[model samples]
Target: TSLFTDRATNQLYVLLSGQLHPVYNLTSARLVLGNPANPATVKSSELSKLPMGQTVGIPGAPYATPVSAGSTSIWTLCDTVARADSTSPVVQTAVIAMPLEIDASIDPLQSHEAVLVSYQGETWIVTTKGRHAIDLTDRALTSSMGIPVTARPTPISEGMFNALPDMGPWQLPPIPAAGAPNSLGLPDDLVIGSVFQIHTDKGPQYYVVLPDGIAQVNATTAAALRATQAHGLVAPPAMVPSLVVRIAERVYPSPLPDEPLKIVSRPQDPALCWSWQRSAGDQSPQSTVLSGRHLPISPSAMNMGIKQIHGTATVYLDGGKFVALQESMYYIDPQGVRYGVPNAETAKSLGLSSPQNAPWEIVRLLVDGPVLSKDAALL
Candidate 1:
């Protein structure tokens, strides 16, 4: 309780007796069961307040005094959890899931409100839907939930590994005949595996797209799959045109003025890892980083909730509901030869909106932003 860390730059002493604590970091991305794979990172204080590589905004939880939206953070109740349906009615017939209590105070954001936040207060599943807080992990708020909502863990800066994302030579894009299957039955069929309960700017659930697949424990044959005593599954897509091509592109960053601010980087956030899969169809140029809980990093992999991040060995297509990827952090060198910077020259020097042709049908290479510049390419 006296000298905390005397190595280099350190000071963290928290040992209060009456402590009402809240701090999370499960490694990120969990909340599943319907359509919730679109939260690689969402407004945790404007991505802990960015200042590098510039591109962040999902703004949603941060307040103590500012109260509402822009928040100041005082903790009236920022932690969330209000799960109810696996087929509600307790165990009406006990189909599969849903059975949790100890409500505490129940205020998991009203859940769009049909109303049901009185459990311990006495109001079990009154009549509302949607609530998947299997202890949140939209990729790092300490890994997420209904409480642990407060920041200052101090990680604002540090060379940042040169703003990461040069993804070697770049050119891994091509592998899409279609993918749809895994209605959460989770056995395998991501090649044509598709399931969209939809409703996402980042919050709805219903996403099982194995866009070239990466980890059913097979990030190119490292191979893995096991989680069905109740819930946990990842196994499908192996050999021939599949190394680990993961993707989850959905960005809104094109609004700037006084610089509203919001930058998240770890809720499946490795630039939402677009395009990857190269067991040597051409592969040589390499760069791989983005795996919190899927087979290589663990905390019991956060009890299997969903934040496996890392899929994309080369490419796979979808450009319909929104897909035009290629920002696996590129640079390139071993000869596959591929570099990036073109969003029409970073949207003409950041004025943005270079919609040359897209009412819908423009697919291949895109990673929007106010691209400051990273500069790297040699193969």
Candidate 2:
């Protein structure tokens, strides 16, 4: 298991592979044990298809075509592992600790599954009871009685980065009181430390954190980073927040020029990342001779496993010019727009009695939709 902090909220989360493990701290009132975060499985095709922010509905399983809940990619999974007696107060106050697997060998069924994945030259215990491969950060395909696993070499390794100590302006959220003694047995600092990377392997084990959550990294980059340092690290090809502003706004006649999205409100579910997207041109066109149009960008088509694309706003300019801006993408039904996949709260936000009509099933919706008009703060 690894830790990940929501940059926007500076809030931390735990992930097994890419599965979000909801944890209960000693001070605050949140319970994670006994509850399974998510039982959703993933198919290979969807892994290579779905767009970064295209949230899909939980249309059940045994799907005809490859399917995904698109929940694992971002902040979605929250179920956590727990000792049957930990919550008993007198049994254990802190969340359960990590490295559940030890150096010694034990029974397959009786032991905590000990499948290891080595990445960047480091070995990490990768088998969590409910954790499964669903995102780029998630482990690769494996056998039931899997041999020692190693991280598969992929383009993902290049994204590693260390968290700088002098957090000039971007400060991480305060470390929770229960973080240190929690299930993972990690210190509060490392739990909130922004220094790390992630990986997938088919022997030696190691651990690191990716933008999404804590994960295993390959041995190479893993050595470069350690428990005490937070500098000169790297990250995924920068996810240019505004697809258009990054590519077109300053250089060309751009339609979208500023923040166009907003998050009205949200809950505390780990899967429910608070920063949703608002897509529309925030500023006036830059070039006088300008023309623009909004287009639908697919997260799957872009090979992004989840709703990573902020929003897509490709602006056109007069005299043969165009630009693109980014925002969190979402779906719309007969009623209105919806961001990310729907949970019970999101469903309630849409005034639904139950999640039975969740809009996650509406995959092919347009990314270019109405902007909230009013600006919302960004992390």
Candidate 3:
């Protein structure tokens, strides 16, 4: 699926099932379509001809849309692998970790481009040969490899970087002479105990080539080494590795929970209830608080019965079987226990006929039971 923005209005939409659905904002768009450089621009008149669908960004909207919910950990899937915060206690506490299944696949990497990635404090270039470490003193060599001196390498997760194969230090080759072959040819083997100077934005920096990698040294130390030892060659960054490109696709455990929309209340007052409902021809539903007194009443919540309890000072409205408090709706059982319904479809599948409004104090007293599933068999 692809995203399109209106040339006239600059509104963004996603194409699905041969219809276009409106997306709320750019941030919500990014969650589904990862970092799209530019979406296709379409004329307003042409857009009007195509079939239109429900506007996304609301709970229960289809096509793997993200919904907001409390989560213990957030996972990012790159290519065939996934990464998350290792420092989080919640991840460490888990007995076993499993890969998340997404509805879409990642796009393959491009062969000509190389991906510059930074892991921990070190920067490396990812090539087909593997990951090669970039020496801090080899800024000139990076520029020769088509990477701009000011280009900031993309930050990669530590776990994801560690999973890559290590190809050791990068090698640099001599620049070809004019009228000669374009290739730099093979790189010379690096010799130990040699000092080299690197031009950086901060100024000049020096490094001593070592057996394992290069080490930065003070100017005095580099000067002492330069007097006695030959200069070391800076390795050229890998030119053959493919660039890892993440394709626009759906991510699992979206910000919004895969559940039914819950009835909510306005911040001004807690006594009144509010619910969302899509009218006959609207693209999406709007929010309105339930009221019969001084405030305006919601279209769907009007005509609800008012009642009073006999013994106590508590008086409640007669909301049928489904009742709500805060931002969630609960299914009241005959035993007086309440179970959370996941979504409207699940409620329909279980024969929950209608919705009713109830007081927060009274609904809170109903003992909370196991949340209801879509396939849950209920009497």
Candidate 4:
């Protein structure tokens, strides 16, 4: 568990059973110690007093030459490789390219008490007790359980993953239904621009508290909001269903630019009422007139027959069709409705090599309808 460096040779060694085992490289020492400065400098005379053991090298490679015994099992001096023996339970740790080099004296290191592993598409954490499946979708719950929110799970074989004793999926502390009394009461108030989570039968759901009402968010939007805005309280189970305005499809950087108008519509109106962007770039903008009420061109004219909205009223515009300054990229259809590009992978799948950014007002107009699927589709 402790590392020492020979002062005379500046060579690193791990102390095991009162014997100093030579470490092949600083990388190996750092791997075992988990920190670079953990190794203590010791005089050559002090190191000479302890008996020398087998030379320890990095878990795998040209350095770990197999003995003539010709075994197929792999081993490590650090907790980088998982042990996949039939008798011994599979040790959970990060994955590395570990070659088969069976050394009877050496065993797989167990420095950390718990480690993350992934099999198929699911992730789990393995410890001395057993393997427990983790619902990574619930980031708030995951972080509350002392697991790193951004930790990369090591890829594990299907057999290794299934062999460990099942500890059941980790559960979140349930929130009481709306108007129900509980020791853990709901947040005193939900702040705007803050993200919150609620556990449902389906799983953990995230929502962003907007000025109007709480907006449900997908995993992607939740992550973006969690990174940028402060996390709010866990909403009650029945509270979000009643108050959710709409699903927030995407997030955009604040202080969006004021560019030439593209298409525009009030959030309070339906998609049929949207007006096309009219300027030198788009002369004779298309208009939809229903019941002799035409779409408004300017903010001042937007009040005609529509509600006299204040400055905080949300506006909808064509993101990709117009000049936008926000980060949420999307594609605009012929009807002037904006469809989210989702992410780079979906964009590439749709043959949309470069999608244009759109302001939140434009992106939030529709309920993220006809979102671009990963499969190639005719728009």
Q: Candidates' lDDT values, in order?
A: 0.20, 0.22, 0.39, 0.39
- Model 2 alpha-carbon miss at residue 320, Å: 41
RMSD of candidate 3 to the truth, in angstroms, is 26.7
Residue by residue across 117-236, what tens digits does model 3's lDDT show? 566777876543346777544544443344555444555444335434576665432211212221212124334455445556666555544443445555544444443333433432
Error of 3 at 18 (Å): 62
Residue range 244-308, candidate 4, lDDT tens digits: 43444343322111121111111211111111122323234322111001222333432321111
User: In each prediction, how many residue pairs overlap at the backbone (N, C-alpha, C within less than 3 A)?
Assistant: 69, 64, 12, 1
Candidate 3 TM-score over all chains jointly: 0.22
Candidate 2 positional error at 378, Å? 21
Q: Please give, for residues 36-134, the per-residue lDDT of candidate 2 as tens digits.
A: 122223333333342232212222111111112211111111111123123221110110001111111211111232222222443332221211222
Runs in model 4 deviating more than 4 A are 1-112, 173-179, 182-379
The C-alpha stretches of model 3 lying farther than 4 A from their native spots are 1-106, 173-379
- Model 2, TM vs. native: 0.15
Higher-TM-score candidate of 1 and 4: 4
lDDT of 1 at 118: 26
